[PDB]
Design a protein around this ligand. Sequence first.
Ligand SMILES: *[C@@H]1O[C@H](CO)[C@@H](O[C@@H]2O[C@H](CO)[C@@H](O)[C@H](O)[C@H]2NC(C)=O)[C@H](O)[C@H]1NC(C)=O
Ligand SMILES: *[C@@H]1O[C@H](CO)[C@@H](O)[C@H](O)[C@H]1NC(C)=O
Ligand SMILES: *[C@@H]1O[C@H](CO)[C@@H](O)[C@H](O)[C@H]1NC(C)=O
Ligand SMILES: *[C@@H]1O[C@H](CO)[C@@H](O)[C@H](O)[C@H]1NC(C)=O
Lengths: 76, 100
Amino acid sequence: VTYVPAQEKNFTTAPAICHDGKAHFPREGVFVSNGTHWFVTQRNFYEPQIITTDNTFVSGNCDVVIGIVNNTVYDP
Amino acid sequence: LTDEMIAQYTSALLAGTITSGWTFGAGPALQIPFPMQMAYRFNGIGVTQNVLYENQKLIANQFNSAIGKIQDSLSSTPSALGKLQDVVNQNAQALNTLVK
Ligand SMILES: *[C@@H]1O[C@H](CO)[C@@H](O[C@@H]2O[C@H](CO)[C@@H](O)[C@H](O)[C@H]2NC(C)=O)[C@H](O)[C@H]1NC(C)=O
Ligand SMILES: *[C@@H]1O[C@H](CO)[C@@H](O)[C@H](O)[C@H]1NC(C)=O
Ligand SMILES: *[C@@H]1O[C@H](CO)[C@@H](O)[C@H](O)[C@H]1NC(C)=O
Ligand SMILES: *[C@@H]1O[C@H](CO)[C@@H](O)[C@H](O)[C@H]1NC(C)=O
């Protein structure tokens, strides 16, 4: 008994998010967008979510990565 | 199968692994940038992914240098393909002994 996925779709992606001069990386997700909004989802199934401080970790300042975008991060 | 057919198969496998990763071995193939694939493979041994994103050039240079050194190491040392040569020699010796 096996598991096979299907019905794929196109999206755009970025390696990291720079907010307030710091680089934010995903925990176990991928950063995706469909337009004017950005979300985080798991690899093997589409499930968007809002970016908070409980699914990202911070390292350094957004000056060393090749490819980084500006966006806001919710603060609970 | 002729030689060019096997070469075509090897090229197909190389292209598939370069452009997709491990996704094409189970179901349809999906596309992803190469540095992200490298970061994901880093996460499989116990290293956080940011380590890759701050040392890209160093890793790329080391990779290229290793490939060049592999070419030179293969070229220089003469006795590196012993197994296949041994197989050919054994078959030829058996046939010659049979004919004699
Ligand atoms: C996908 O894009 C659509 C539009 O192209 C977004 O739809 C609206 O987004 C706003 C703000 O994000 C919401 O207030 C609206 O409720 C959304 N729907 C409509 C009908 O306006 C959508 O947010 C994007 N993301 C997802 C996951 O669908
Ligand atoms: C995604 O985009 C490519 C071109 O970039 C296009 O050929 C393809 O039909 C699109 N959709 C899917 C599901 O790949
Ligand atoms: C992606 O490729 C385009 C095409 O050359 C380039 O302009 C852009 O800077 C690249 N983005 C990266 C490497 O983040
Ligand atoms: C992000 O915003 C800063 C100012 O807040 C700006 O200088 C920088 O160019 C922006 N970068 C991107 C990728 O939008």
